[PDB]
From Swiss-Prot, chains A, B, C:
It is found in: Virion; Host cytoplasm. InterPro entries: Baseplate-like_2-layer_sand, Baseplate_GpP, Gp44/GpP-like_2nd, Gp44/GpP-like_C, GpP-like_N. Forms the central cylindrical hub of the baseplate and plays an important role in baseplate and tail assembly. Core component of the initiator complex that triggers the tail tube polymerization during tail assembly. Forms a conduit that probably functions as an extension of the tail tube allowing viral DNA release during ejection. Might facilitate the interaction of the virus with the host cell surface through electrostatic interactions during virus entry into host cell. Gene3D superfamilies: Baseplate protein-like domain - beta roll fold (2.30.300.10), Baseplate protein-like domains (3.55.50.10), Baseplate protein-like domains - 2 layer sandwich fold (3.30.1920.10). It comes from the Viruses. This is Baseplate hub protein gp44. Heterotrimer of one uncleaved (42 kDa) and two cleaved (40 kDa) forms. Forms a hub-like structure with an inner diameter of 25 Angstroms through which DNA can presumably pass during infection. Part of a complex composed of three DNA circularization protein N, three baseplate hub protein gp44 and three sub-complex wedge (made of two copies of each baseplate protein gp46, gp47 and gp48) that forms the baseplate. GO terms for biological process: symbiont genome ejection through host cell envelope, contractile tail mechanism; viral tail assembly. One of its GO terms (cellular component) is host cell cytoplasm.
Amino acid sequence: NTVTLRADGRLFTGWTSVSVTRSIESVAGYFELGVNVPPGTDLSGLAPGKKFTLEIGGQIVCTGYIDSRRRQMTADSMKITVAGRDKTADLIDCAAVYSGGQWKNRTLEQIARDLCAPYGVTVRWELSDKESSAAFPGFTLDHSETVYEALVRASRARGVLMTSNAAGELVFSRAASTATDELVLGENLLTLDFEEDFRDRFSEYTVKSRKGTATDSDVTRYRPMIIIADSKITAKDAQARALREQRRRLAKSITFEAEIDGWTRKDGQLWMPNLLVTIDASKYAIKTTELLVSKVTLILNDQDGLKTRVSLAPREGFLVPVESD
Amino acid sequence: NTVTLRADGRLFTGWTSVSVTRSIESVAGYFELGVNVPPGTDLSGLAPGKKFTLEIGGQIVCTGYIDSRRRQMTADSMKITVAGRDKTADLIDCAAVYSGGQWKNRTLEQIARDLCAPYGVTVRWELSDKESSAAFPGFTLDHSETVYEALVRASRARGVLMTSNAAGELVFSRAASTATDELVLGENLLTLDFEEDFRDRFSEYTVKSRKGTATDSDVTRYRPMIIIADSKITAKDAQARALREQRRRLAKSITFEAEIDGWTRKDGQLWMPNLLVTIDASKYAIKTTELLVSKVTLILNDQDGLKTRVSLAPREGFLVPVESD
Amino acid sequence: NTVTLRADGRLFTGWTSVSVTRSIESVAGYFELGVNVPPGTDLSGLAPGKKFTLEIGGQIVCTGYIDSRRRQMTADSMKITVAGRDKTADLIDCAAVYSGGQWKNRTLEQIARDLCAPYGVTVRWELSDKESSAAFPGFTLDHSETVYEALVRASRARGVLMTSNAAGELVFSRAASTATDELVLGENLLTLDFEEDFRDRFSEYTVKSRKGTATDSDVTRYRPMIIIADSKITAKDAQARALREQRRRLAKSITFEAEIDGWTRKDGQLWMPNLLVTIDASKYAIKTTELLVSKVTLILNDQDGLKTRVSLAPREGFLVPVESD
């Protein structure tokens, strides 16, 4: 639909270039808009630091602060490029700070609340299982680490994913488990780039003399990878690390890059990551099972048209094994 | 004007490709010339290692040694590319060596003299204040560090910049403080690319439990960055490091990339870095204060013409805070 | 001639894109084939993990496992790209594993046998001198290092090169010493790119207080490089390391990139690395001595034709100095 940027209380529309990205791998979506402006156009509202809201046809798709403003000019004209990120960008950028220094008997959601507080970021817990909500006997910050880094460690200790959403909140969840969309070649799926790469896949991963391992049945030949770990590591944290490794490789090994027509799914909602979907390219013998959308890039160009780039990988690659500490 | 390369005592002119760069960030300017040569052309003088002098319309703009020679040929023709750097390149490349191993009650200028001596590089002290010239009770080299690295540490201990000039001398100074040129869009300024990027800017920088901090008023929201430092660090060396960090980010955050017509300034001199200037792009509401030229690239191409690329950033980004050791 | 890929027992031909690379620097040649396929084409045999044999006009040029399969499709057509490497790729990828953990009085060839065994890779010893075959009083693996890394250390301890060949075997040898081919500009040599770069060349290299050095007569001015090494290092392992450094720089400093017509040498054999050759570009005053082929890339494209890319550097750059441990 129509792209609108709400900044400095003002409203900006008419962008000739648009690119909005959001992925699981990150705790912050990114956006970038472009357009040529006639001399004498006030751009005071698109200044870095300005609070913004990025809307499309109405529904908000990103809220945070403007990161950058670029003006390229000649005697004749000027091209402006504005870029920003979800409020959660501060968590990725800045140090973890907590009046105390640690927590006692506090859950992940609770520790996140505290870390997020000074950044004015709200935490969104979308889990309803006992394991993930279990409290941490104790949790301590690690010298100057970012909020994001501290939370990766705690979230990893609870086997949950951390992401962000429009509105700019920190969301805790797990890879979608129910398929809700279908990509069909020739219809909503304009182009599909399916890549199966085993260069970094191993038959068995062994961490460190304590030890633990994870195997990968898809790798037909003997291909071991050894990971050196701390001497004092549970047979559990070993098996977990090993497994994390196997899944990370799976994720990067089996991938689909799809070009969708338009920006919305069948149900009208805008494409977003963490959606389980299926692909049908039968014409080329390709019909897939459950693929998780790891990333989405909504673009608008003159030589690209209104398209969405969707990256997908096996759901299993995004399950977070439980690792202590 | 006309580009001439004086090498092996000979004189070479007629280059079809020319690119000469000099920036504050470095202690050595770089150059590269190109041209197609008819079979049977002696290029023995453009051999790597050959001492050279690069002149433009007369005035020398770079002197050092040829670093490389490239010949690309077909049955029909050959394209030659020669590249070199100021004599000071050796200081960036090679180990710091000193018959003794340390100095006692010696100034920065004096320590530089010694380190530069074996490389046949002359030191140019362009400072006349007591602080910068203060002698070092003691100064010691650090296992295999380069001349450049040793001098960065000592120059940092005196809050001064280190650069090179035509003639290839090591120059000590501070960011220019007097504006002497004006870039006007449509006139001498053909194109301007103004970039304001706050992705790496923080509201406060804190180094390390000793501590010290520096804030950045331009960053409206709470965005802290913690820098872990040695336990035994002065409240001074802490505040200094913190401040260095703030300025380095400023430098990379607010930048202008300008395309100037020709190679000379209004007063006839060739463009060079460390010049305080002002920019006027009023047509697009842009009129700036004092910007320091951090880099200059003089180019000559068939599809570029005779132009100069000038990179500018706030002067304050280039002031060197005093840090001990 | 004709490019055929034997995979899954099947035979695939008609590739529109072909690129096969092999270089000394590596223990595994790489290949990649491309072609557009009509809907309904079975590609089950080109699946990652599949054992393959890459033949050209008959003679095999690479044998190993398929690493990747890529399918790019639109409603209209699909482009397939398959890539693989010599069997030896596993040695570069995987951990060194040995039922014991060490060897006693075993030669390089023997240690390689053992390390290679679980990967089903056969060792090819092409040396007949006493030094290289001398047994190691003792040799021990180093926590999780790859087979390739363990063997680099042992092969370095014997001054020999390690490479791979078609058939996918691990070969031990030394840089070819007899010239067997001549590249002549205008004839078999279509284009030549000769680069002489001294930016990373030093007059003297000194390792670490034990010490040892190597000089480089080609560097006319004083340019020292110091390499910090372990305190307990022989005056021998010092001189050796220093020399390795000098040769590595030589290799990257004086280089020729040549475009050969076709894929075969004069004697009919396909171009391969580790061939001593001479170049004659007299038309441009260039007639070289003995250059070693460090790499070869056999390509077939629509806008490139049937060509071979040959990279060459001074033979001396590839002699492996003896370093203990």
